[PDB]
Symmetry: D2
Subunit: 203 residues, 4 copies
């Protein structure tokens, strides 16, 4: 809760080369994510009664926040949560394909990893403008693939995020320019499915 | 949970005369509310995995429901929950002014009952078209007065409803015609604040 | 343009009996439409620069209007325009089935009056809450059947309304109560297709 | 009308250096604008009846277009129109401050170029995610500063665009990365106010 902090990236900026360039990792983490944390803290600073609330809870209750900070919390709180998840999902050294319980749910519900990749790729490519593509779980045990605009996080709608892929141009412009599809092909090489499994089990 | 049932009104249709006419109470309960229950059950019938979920939960997770029934659940599930609360709030024999813990929160936050009545009246009069005016509580202990369109219930946004006033024309047309303001003046005579207090304490 | 006028019905309030009751015709014209005109004028009084503009123009450029009157113009301006068309469409003595050029357009695009009646009935039945069902024409010569919420008029989206059916509860509650279907069945006996032809030809 | 054409920039890709880099100008025109034109044409190929319509007309009547192409036209049609205006506004060799009738309008409504630059900068800075900041004219002779999301163009709401500033990340990421503010500071050196005057006069 408040004051929110920029999480450690956790590995060297060049750990994901040649899939994601080092310069992007640094700017994405230090500048983009760093700015969302600053702005989120700046919004919440004037309302002490919201100081002990986790960001997930603020996002599930946007409509209850003072009107003058709802957009700032949505954008920046969503930006903080989304990127926090993203850095963990990109941790080197994990399974490159779904494993464990998440694997069984994916096989059962989508027919297997190949079918999921295709659906997640379609949702990411179809997100016009800035956004994120997601694999989420609902309270009823079903998995869904969807995309959200800008920094909106699926917890706003009651879902629990499992995998998120950043499709803002800043996530891929330096190395791939307009070629979002090439960026998506490369992301599969660095996703950590042991981390996705933890997210899946935890909720 | 499924199959949902029309709740007993709980008192004679004429119990609220001369404030709300008996004919409206009967049609509002049997026909309007009866239709929302039927339609909600018809939507959920084809999805057994949703059969043990309370209506409040379905409404908090609309985005997760099969696409072909999201609107039907929103409209009819919202219609069922809204009117269920309304019949209880209109139970004869209760306090005519806020009492207990809800009274302390209202005095503290709005300055007293008179200030609340004025705010709730403004929200009800300002709801253009069909809708409901509400006094709700959020998870952070604050009260809000707002209105929602059609049969939307504030649980969709994370709030807990305390008092709801139906402003669909069917709620007042037979006796008051276009005079929504006269209907609102009369509603204060039949609200049960002991029931509002229970809602307030319970969440 | 400003100050707008409530148009005369042009026929006695009892002229559509037993299809639509006289008391509703009177209240619907004098109280509902009368209030929309009055409120539209009150909104526009403060901005002399908008006094020479027809309501249709104001509605097509809502986004340009001063922020404090946008909703008032949308709601009361739409209320004014929708009801003015409606009174003309209910004028006694006209053709009871489509005639002329509109007939030709209906037979080519929908397949016949029977097919159009079914689509329009579905559209009126499917409008949850307050709204209007419409037969409209676009600039490319296509006819569409759609519904709009509250007092929104299809001119806001670039369509030209030909037939509009009021499905707010005040339009039918006194005589039909919850039975919107019985009300739509009755409307077919009173719609004036020579007026609809006029609207279609000036389209 | 159809088939739409990618317009030539009309100047070398390096003409705006060091304000906007040549590599961005090239990719922005050939790859981004080129794809919007290509995709717009692909959407329209299936509906011969829409082939004689200018893109502005298609955008003002999106609601009338077949459902399967509405988004494609909105996004790629808006992309086409926004970028075509943008290349013209960046034409080298024009006035660096407002001139002529637009100047008069700016001085009367905003108080001067300095006041307009501040409003437009705020509007560009405040557009979260992808979008465009605009100076637009309405039918009543008022100038407005607003922003739009993604490739939405103000013509959809009845405005005539005069100045449009692209704030999608692809417009500035190669040279400025996260520093949108530095990019806006640079744009003032390259905007052609004689072209803006032309747009304002044909308004
Ligand atoms: Mn990012
Ligand atoms: Mn009701
Ligand atoms: Mn009406
Ligand atoms: Mn661009």
């Amino acid at each position: 809760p408040y004051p929110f902090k920029l999480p450690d990236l956790g590995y060297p900026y060049e750990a994901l080369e040649p899939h994601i360039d080092a310069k992007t990792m640094e700017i994405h983490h230090q500048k983009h994510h760093g700015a969302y944390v600053t702005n989120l803290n700046a919004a919440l600073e004037k309302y002490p009664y919201l100081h002990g609330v986790e960001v997930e809870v603020l996002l599930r209750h946007l409509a209850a926040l003072p009107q003058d900070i709802q957009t700032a919390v949505r954008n920046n709180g969503g930006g903080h949560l989304n990127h926090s998840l993203f850095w963990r999902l990109l941790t080197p050294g994990g399974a490159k394909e779904p494993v464990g319980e998440l694997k069984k749910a994916i096989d059962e519900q989508f027919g297997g990893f190949q079918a999921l990749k295709e659906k997640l790729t379609q949702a990411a490519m179809g997100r016009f403008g800035s956004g994120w593509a997601w694999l989420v779980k609902d309270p009823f045990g079903k998995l869904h693939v969807l995309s959200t605009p800008n920094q909106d996080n699926p917890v706003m709608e009651g879902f629990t995020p499992i995998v998120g892929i950043d499709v803002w141009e800043h996530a891929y412009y330096l190395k791939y320019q307009n070629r979002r599809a090439d960026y998506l092909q490369a992301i599969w090489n660095v996703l950590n499915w042991d981390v996705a499994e933890e997210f899946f089990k935890k909720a």
